[PDB]
Amino acid sequence: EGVKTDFGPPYFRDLLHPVIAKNYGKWKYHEVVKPGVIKRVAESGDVIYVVRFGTPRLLSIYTVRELCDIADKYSDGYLRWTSRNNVEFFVTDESKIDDLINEVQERVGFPCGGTWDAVKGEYGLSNIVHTQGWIHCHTPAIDASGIVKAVMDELYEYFTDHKLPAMCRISLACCANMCGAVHASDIAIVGIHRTPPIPNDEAIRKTCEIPSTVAACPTGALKPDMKNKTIKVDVEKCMYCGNCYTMCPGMPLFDPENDGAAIMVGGKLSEARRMPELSKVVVPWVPNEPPRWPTLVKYVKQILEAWAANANKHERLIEWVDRIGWERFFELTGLEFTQHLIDDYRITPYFYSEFRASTQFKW
Amino acid sequence: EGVKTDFGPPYFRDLLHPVIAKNYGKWKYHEVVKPGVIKRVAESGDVIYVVRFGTPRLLSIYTVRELCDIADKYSDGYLRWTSRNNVEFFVTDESKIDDLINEVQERVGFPCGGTWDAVKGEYGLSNIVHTQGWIHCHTPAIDASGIVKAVMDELYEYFTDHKLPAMCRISLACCANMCGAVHASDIAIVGIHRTPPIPNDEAIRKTCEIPSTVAACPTGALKPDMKNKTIKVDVEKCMYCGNCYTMCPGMPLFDPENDGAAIMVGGKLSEARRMPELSKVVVPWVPNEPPRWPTLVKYVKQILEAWAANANKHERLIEWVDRIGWERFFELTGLEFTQHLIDDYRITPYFYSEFRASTQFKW
Amino acid sequence: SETPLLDELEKGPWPSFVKEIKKTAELMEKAAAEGKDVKMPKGARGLLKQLEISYKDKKTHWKHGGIVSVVGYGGGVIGRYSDLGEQIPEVEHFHTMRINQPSGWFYSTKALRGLCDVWEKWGSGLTNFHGSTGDIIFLGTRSEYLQPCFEDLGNLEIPFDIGGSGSDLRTPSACMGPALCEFACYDTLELCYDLTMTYQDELHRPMWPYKFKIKCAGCPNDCVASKARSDFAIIGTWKDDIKVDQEAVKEYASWMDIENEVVKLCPTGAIKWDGKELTIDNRECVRCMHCINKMPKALKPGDERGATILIGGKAPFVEGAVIGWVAVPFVEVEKPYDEIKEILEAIWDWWDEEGKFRERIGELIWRKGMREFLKVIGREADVRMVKAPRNNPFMFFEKDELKPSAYTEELKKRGMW
Amino acid sequence: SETPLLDELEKGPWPSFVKEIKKTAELMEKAAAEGKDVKMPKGARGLLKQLEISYKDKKTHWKHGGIVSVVGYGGGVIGRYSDLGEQIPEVEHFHTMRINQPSGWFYSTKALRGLCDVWEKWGSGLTNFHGSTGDIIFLGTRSEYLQPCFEDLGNLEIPFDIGGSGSDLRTPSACMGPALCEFACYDTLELCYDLTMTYQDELHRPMWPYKFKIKCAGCPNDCVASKARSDFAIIGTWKDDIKVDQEAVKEYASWMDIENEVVKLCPTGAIKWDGKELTIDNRECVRCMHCINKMPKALKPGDERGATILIGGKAPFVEGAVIGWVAVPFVEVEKPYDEIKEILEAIWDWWDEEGKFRERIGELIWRKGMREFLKVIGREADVRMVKAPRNNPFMFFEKDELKPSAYTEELKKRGMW
Numbered sequence A, B: 001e002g003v004k005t006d007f008g009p010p011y012f013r014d015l016l017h018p019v020i021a022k023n024y025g026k027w028k029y030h031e032v033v034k035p036g037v038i039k040r041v042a043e044s045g046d047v048i049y050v051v052r053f054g055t056p057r058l059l060s061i062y063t064v065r066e067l068c069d070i071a072d073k074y075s076d077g078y079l080r081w082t083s084r085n086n087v088e089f090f091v092t093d094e095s096k097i098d099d100l101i102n103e104v105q106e107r108v109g110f111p112c113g114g115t116w117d118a119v120k121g122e123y124g125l126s127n128i129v130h131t132q133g134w135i136h137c138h139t140p141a142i143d144a145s146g147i148v149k150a151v152m153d154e155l156y157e158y159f160t161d162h163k164l165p166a167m168c169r170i171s172l173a174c175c176a177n178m179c180g181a182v183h184a185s186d187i188a189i190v191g192i193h194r195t196p197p198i199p200n201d202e203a204i205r206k207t208c209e210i211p212s213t214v215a216a217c218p219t220g221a222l223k224p225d226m227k228n229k230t231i232k233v234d235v236e237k238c239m240y241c242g243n244c245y246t247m248c249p250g251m252p253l254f255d256p257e258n259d260g261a262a263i264m265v266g267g268k269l270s271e272a273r274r275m276p277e278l279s280k281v282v283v284p285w286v287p288n289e290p291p292r293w294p295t296l297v298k299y300v301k302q303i304l305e306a307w308a309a310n311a312n313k314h315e316r317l318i319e320w321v322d323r324i325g326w327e328r329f330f331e332l333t334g335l336e337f338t339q340h341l342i343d344d345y346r347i348t349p350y351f352y353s354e355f356r357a358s359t360q361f362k363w
Numbered sequence C, D: 001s002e003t004p005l006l007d008e009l010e011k012g013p014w015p016s017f018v019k020e021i022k023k024t025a026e027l028m029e030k031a032a033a034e035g036k037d038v039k040m041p042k043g044a045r046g047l048l049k050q051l052e053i054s055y056k057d058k059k060t061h062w063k064h065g066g067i068v069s070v071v072g073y074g075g076g077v078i079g080r081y082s083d084l085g086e087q088i089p090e091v092e093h094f095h096t097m098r099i100n101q102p103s104g105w106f107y108s109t110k111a112l113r114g115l116c117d118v119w120e121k122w123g124s125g126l127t128n129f130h131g132s133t134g135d136i137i138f139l140g141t142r143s144e145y146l147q148p149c150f151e152d153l154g155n156l157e158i159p160f161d162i163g164g165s166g167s168d169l170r171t172p173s174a175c176m177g178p179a180l181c182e183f184a185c186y187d188t189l190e191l192c193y194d195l196t197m198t199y200q201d202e203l204h205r206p207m208w209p210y211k212f213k214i215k216c217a218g219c220p221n222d223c224v225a226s227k228a229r230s231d232f233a234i235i236g237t238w239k240d241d242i243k244v245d246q247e248a249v250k251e252y253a254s255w256m257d258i259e260n261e262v263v264k265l266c267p268t269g270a271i272k273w274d275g276k277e278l279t280i281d282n283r284e285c286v287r288c289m290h291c292i293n294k295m296p297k298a299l300k301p302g303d304e305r306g307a308t309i310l311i312g313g314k315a316p317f318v319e320g321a322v323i324g325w326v327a328v329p330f331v332e333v334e335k336p337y338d339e340i341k342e343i344l345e346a347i348w349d350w351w352d353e354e355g356k357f358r359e360r361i362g363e364l365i366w367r368k369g370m371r372e373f374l375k376v377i378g379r380e381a382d383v384r385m386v387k388a389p390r391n392n393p394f395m396f397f398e399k400d401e402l403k404p405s406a407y408t409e410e411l412k413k414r415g416m417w
């Protein structure tokens, strides 16, 4: 016998809904019925109705189980998750969708929507991809599930309806390790520190490996203290990234009062209309204000609004900016350009700007 | 008494034609009459014609004296040079313009032309900016004056008539310190080495200050050799820039069979229609073949004709490439793309690409 | 009120995570009170209390600690220790287990229920559905429950294995591709499962200088964000002409403004509508997907399908944030994907031999150059790899490209060159 | 022939530099034979002979120079020594003197004649009109002649001083500006002259980490290529509306395709034309000049004039070639230009204090950052300085921007912060 290993996940093909399995790779066209409901028509003429709801990522197994209890009714025992942590059910009897939606929102209270129709040209706001925060992570400057909750509560009307003239991703990273799609989102909330690390000369001898810690500093702010057998931080060079704490339990830089979030903007992953683009810092620091984080939510909302109100059909935040420029951007969004926004990260090579970071080329 | 010093150049206003002095900063408009001939109309009603001629830049004092006799005859004793080293005369009597052009042509062999007309949208090729090459310089990979002559002989027809659809500047640097604006030229000829230096230890010891010669290497391919009071080169990091020989006579790297020129393309200085741009390598290397450099001249001509044949009115080389993409540029110019042209100069910061290198912004 | 700060977040129209945590404890402690075989019933409450403490403190209460793993595997379990281990004994150990997700996150009810039973038995009751990399996250168990939980996962009727962490191949992920999508240029899911299977050892046993990620996008819309979130993004594409159902375009043209919404929005102006007919100059097309996005009943990807491979994607750390750039402009994707596999393995051999401690693949490419990288994958340089040729003349030349000379003989004589 | 290779370069239509060299040789040799006072009658012939051997060898025959100067100056004369000086003694020393040009290269024949009489007496007879920076080049003399050559230059009816070289303020230069050009936004020639005279000492006596170059362009067309070829690019601009003569535009409309050659070519779509009247949304205009260049009888730069200052332009060495970037969006240019001098003097003191050996201002700014630079010239950060905000969150914050905290008190307690 002995413990079985290296057997992988279960094969996906055995786990598909009958109709889905039957028309694998033989679809004819999709059609967004209303928000949160997409109709898919197969070449063989068979019809399925994909039904999307928003989850809070973090799920209790009992919630998961009630979803299963839901799937055994309306979707033949079948369901998927999306790449923004939405739950999707598969309906084949279309006179049943408006009940699935009722029952879900009454059993687990999972909103329908998080969809978009580029055909007409009216988009919903979808889920916020996020990380761990104070729930499970040891290096967060901000809490994810808390900020997500607050923002989504404010921006609820956008998720259920197709209110926006183009697609908008909001994303969250709890620190500079930027987990998720956060470095390429239309709007990104990034956890930062504003204070340098104070060496724990004690824990450094006992735990850390000094040469590799020193080696992890992007600005060369660290140097081995030979005496002494510890690390010296040159404060003039430290931009408080917190990488050194990743390597070394002896390098905390947490200051409850000065940790907070930066807000970046104008990222894009898709090829469509214009090339993919990295996010850009437009709001240097907002504080942690648990539980409701009003400073942060007000700025996020204020950026979204200013963009909704002015952008053409399809024109995404970065494309808007392409059109009006950073001058008119800053004025319209009502934000302030300060010196913090002038890039000074020396290490990234210029030649990257000359590489084709996109599948857009001619044959 | 003592020797006069710190007195500066003669004051230009004392050296202006009376009509130019009178109408200074009081012009109504200019009009390009024909190639080489620009009419300037002052608010006073005065009209002056500015007549432009190509020059080899290197002048005999006896040529200068001839040009003076001519200026006394046609332009009241006044003349100027331009920022591309053309020479201009000032004529108040329009009936004397052709007499001037013909006498210049006869006496000194300088051709009338070098002009362009944005209004009608027809452009001449003006003079090639260039440097000392083997005539005077100790760090050249290529000759300057021989190449400019061989190229201008082949492209002559473009200097004397407005035959191109947009501006095109051709510039030449005899080595990578690229004296001139060769780094921002529609077509740039840049001399390069392809072989690493061989340290002459005796000469390094005698004459070279080691730490600053070491610090002049952009790749960190130079290290001090304390034992032998000299420098060692890691040939694997050297890309033959020659900067160490500039610093140190014991670091020569010249190889008459492997020195030659790269051809770069698509620089722009002006703001008109699109932002300025640094030139880009499209031919890694062509050999020195004095006195006529047939291989280099063939490539320059091939690139110019391909652009001129496909370009819209006002569309300079870079703007043509903005339209077609680099894929078609390479096909249409018939050039080969190799790994050489993939940028690997690591020291330059990415953030520079985020700085506004242009006077174009909104108020 | 035990948690007055967190309670404020059970309000609102959005589903509450606080409500997920309070449900977990309440029913787990109801489970253990009913005699059920549950080893960490206090797990969720302990976590709730620590989260309430953190909310007042405005600081995390998790710390560094021991490396932890199952027998046989190197990655998959992420160790976590609370710095309130004596005050809250239950969250003293709160480990994450990364459970491998099936391609495109499709699931039967049975499958999910098997996961529910195991975790309810050995862990907290909290999960992430889904993690960013794509794994099912098991959130909160002790060191001594790791192995038996994993044995039970393996022994399920629908059995799940451990995902990846550390310096290994991370769990691959895919878009929904041909399961639901009419836009898909290859079978993403099958590619994703097959790669997960082929390199089980590389995923389970970390031997590399750092982590490595693969993500599979059916087409250029990149619905799994592969170009940013994976070192090796396999994004679908085509080579022949876009299929144009001309009568279907008319349908659209009866209610849509194709001039403004489609035509004038074409990156390259490849697509035209004169009111009579649609013309696409596929020589000019960059295959950005927009027109097909606008008109999916009428427009389709061409028949000559494969994938573009973007190399280097990563978050900012050390050398900067990278959207992946072009490595392989076109590659076939057909089972058993040996052309793709040759590429991946050649990259790993070189990366393992040349990489520094914690150097991502993109940083290695930056350091060593595109020339060395391309020879390693045995591909030639291509203009499509760059947005523009280099802006400086500082080119390296290989020894063999040089003309023989007195100088090259001097270099040979000395032992350099 | 004694010069069979250079002889080939007497053929062809373009005026020959070889003819220039031979003409000098024949006529210097003739003057000396007539008993005129010519110190270097054979200089030009020697140069010819060396250039010929250089053409045969495909290599320079010049070596690194001894340092040479006129009494009282440390810059302006470049020593050049031939490696062929035993074979060709007449070019054993062949130094260059850079002679400061009048602003915009404007001369009268009396001025040029004085230069020719002096150079004929003390040098080879060979010259460059002009060197790239802008200077007249006296091409080839011996050490013992530099001082008395300089003395004659200074005693001319119209006298000429030496220009810049080494680690100094180089000879500033200017486009023709208002002398000829209806586009000029300020008096380039006057500003250039005033700077040259104000900073005679900084020019003649090198004191700095490296060289510093200033160039004056009357408007955004930049006809002296200041942004690429000077560390401090003064480029004329305006703040108010473009002046539009409507009846001149209609005169243009009658023959010129305004829509295609003007309207469609504006970078910002700021300028419309409808058959009757031309409209410019001066809030959208970025003063690129194209419409004005296109319709000079109808369109002019606005009345509130001044300059934008672009900082850091240089050739490649060390850290890469630079087109200068926006340092000062708008400065006034009114004599005696105190505000510009203020900015210059602040930059120079800071750069002399902080700069490494052979570090250019551009490089120093890259190394110290834009905040330190801006504080030095006492200006605030402006969005017009960037093409885009930063793509990473690694910002430096100043001590006083932080909230007082237990941690900041710890930092104070230790002696950091």
Ligand code: SRM
Binding pocket: A030, A038, A040, A050, A081, A082, A083, A084, A085, A086, A114, A115, A117, A118, A119, A126, A127, A167, A169, A181, A184, A185, A186, A267, A268, A269, A270, A271, A272, C174, C175, C176, C177, C180, C181, C182, C183, C221, C222, C223, C224, C225, C293, C294
């Ligand atoms: C649901 C989801 C599939 C999956 O889980 O694998 C998805 C599904 C589709 N995406 Fe997507 N996209 C999914 C991730 C994304 C995201 C990726 C992300 O958020 O990180 C974006 C990339 C965002 C970016 O570029 O920054 C994405 C880029 C697109 C593009 C966007 C075009 C644009 O305006 O730039 C198209 C838009 C369109 O079809 O008009 C698109 C549209 C679609 C369509 C409607 C296309 C189609 O049917 O051919 C798919 C509908 C699914 C259905 O009927 O059930 N999908 N798509 C994705 C999960 C997100 C969610 O729950 O909402």
Ligand code: SRM
Binding pocket: B030, B032, B081, B082, B083, B084, B085, B086, B114, B115, B116, B117, B118, B119, B126, B127, B167, B169, B181, B184, B185, B267, B268, B269, B270, B271, B272, B314, D104, D174, D175, D176, D177, D180, D181, D182, D183, D221, D222, D223, D224, D225, D293, D294, D296
């Ligand atoms: C005489 C001279 C200034 C000087 O002090 O010497 C000059 C004079 C004029 N320039 Fe210039 N430019 C002069 C060098 C330049 C250069 C600098 C260089 O080449 O190093 C450029 C920057 C080049 C670049 O953009 O890379 C320059 C870019 C322009 C532009 C832009 C053309 C474009 O479409 O981008 C204008 C517009 C135009 O074409 O009318 C211009 C226009 C003009 C106008 C028409 C302005 C006017 O209202 O009179 C002047 C007449 C030129 C003509 O032939 O039509 N001038 N101009 C320059 C003579 C060069 C020569 O002998 O050919």
Ligand code: SRM
Binding pocket: B130, B131, B132, B136, B137, B138, B139, B177, B178, B179, B180, B181, B246, D078, D080, D096, D098, D128, D130, D131, D132, D133, D134, D135, D136, D163, D164, D171, D211, D213, D228, D229, D230, D313, D314, D315, D316, D317, D318, D360
């Ligand atoms: C005479 C002149 C060439 C010509 O025939 O026109 C010249 C010639 C030399 N240049 Fe230059 N440069 C000349 C204008 C330039 C320009 C353009 C400009 O000033 O308009 C540049 C680009 C802007 C800049 O300086 O970056 C230029 C960038 C350089 C470089 C690189 C500096 C850098 O930061 O990258 C070198 C290297 C150095 O500084 O040691 C240099 C150095 C040299 C040296 C001393 C040679 C060396 O390797 O040490 C040259 C001596 C030639 C000789 O002995 O006859 N020269 N050089 C040009 C000046 C004459 C004048 O007074 O007008």
Ligand code: SRM
Binding pocket: A131, A132, A136, A137, A138, A139, A177, A178, A179, A180, A181, A246, C078, C079, C096, C098, C130, C131, C132, C133, C134, C135, C137, C165, C166, C213, C228, C229, C230, C313, C314, C315, C316, C317, C318, C360
């Ligand atoms: C953005 C992303 C990959 C990337 O390189 O682009 C990433 C980024 C990093 N993660 Fe992660 N994590 C990413 C998925 C996740 C997820 C989501 C998941 O598991 O599906 C989690 C939550 C899992 C959990 O329950 O903890 C996650 C939690 C972690 C943990 C704990 C944080 C830490 O640094 O201590 C590891 C560290 C470890 O191995 O114990 C980590 C560590 C890191 C570090 C700091 C690497 C390290 O350990 O030094 C990241 C560096 C990236 C860089 O080079 O800048 N990352 N990381 C991942 C984004 C999603 C994706 O792959 O599409």
Ligand code: SF4
Binding pocket: A131, A132, A133, A137, A138, A139, A140, A141, A173, A174, A175, A176, A177, A178, A179
């Ligand atoms: S972004 Fe930072 S704090 Fe958040 S889960 Fe990742 S490593 Fe932890």
Ligand code: SF4
Binding pocket: A196, A197, A216, A217, A218, A219, A220, A221, A222, A233, A237, A238, A239, A240, A241, A242, A243, A244, A245, A253
């Ligand atoms: S926080 Fe970042 S920049 Fe500061 S010392 Fe640590 S690793 Fe270096």
Ligand code: SF4
Binding pocket: B131, B132, B133, B137, B138, B139, B140, B141, B173, B174, B175, B176, B177, B178, B179
């Ligand atoms: S470009 Fe090079 S070789 Fe030519 S003059 Fe300048 S430094 Fe000398």
Ligand code: SF4
Binding pocket: B196, B197, B216, B217, B218, B219, B220, B221, B222, B233, B237, B238, B239, B240, B241, B242, B243, B244, B245, B253
């Ligand atoms: S030639 Fe250039 S790369 Fe080579 S050692 Fe000298 S300075 Fe360095």
Ligand code: SF4
Binding pocket: C175, C176, C177, C178, C181, C182, C183, C184, C185, C217, C218, C219, C220, C221, C222, C223, C224
């Ligand atoms: S990336 Fe392409 S194939 Fe995959 S789900 Fe998105 S549109 Fe469909």
Ligand code: SF4
Binding pocket: A273, C265, C266, C267, C268, C269, C270, C271, C280, C284, C285, C286, C287, C288, C289, C290, C291, C292
């Ligand atoms: S896929 Fe994009 S580039 Fe191609 S024709 Fe359609 S819109 Fe244009």
Ligand code: SF4
Binding pocket: D175, D176, D177, D178, D181, D182, D183, D184, D185, D217, D218, D219, D220, D221, D222, D223, D224
């Ligand atoms: S820079 Fe402007 S002002 Fe100067 S000559 Fe050129 S167009 Fe005229």
Ligand code: SF4
Binding pocket: B273, D265, D266, D267, D268, D269, D270, D271, D280, D284, D285, D286, D287, D288, D289, D290, D291, D292
């Ligand atoms: S100067 Fe340029 S931006 Fe301004 S209206 Fe004219 S063409 Fe447009």
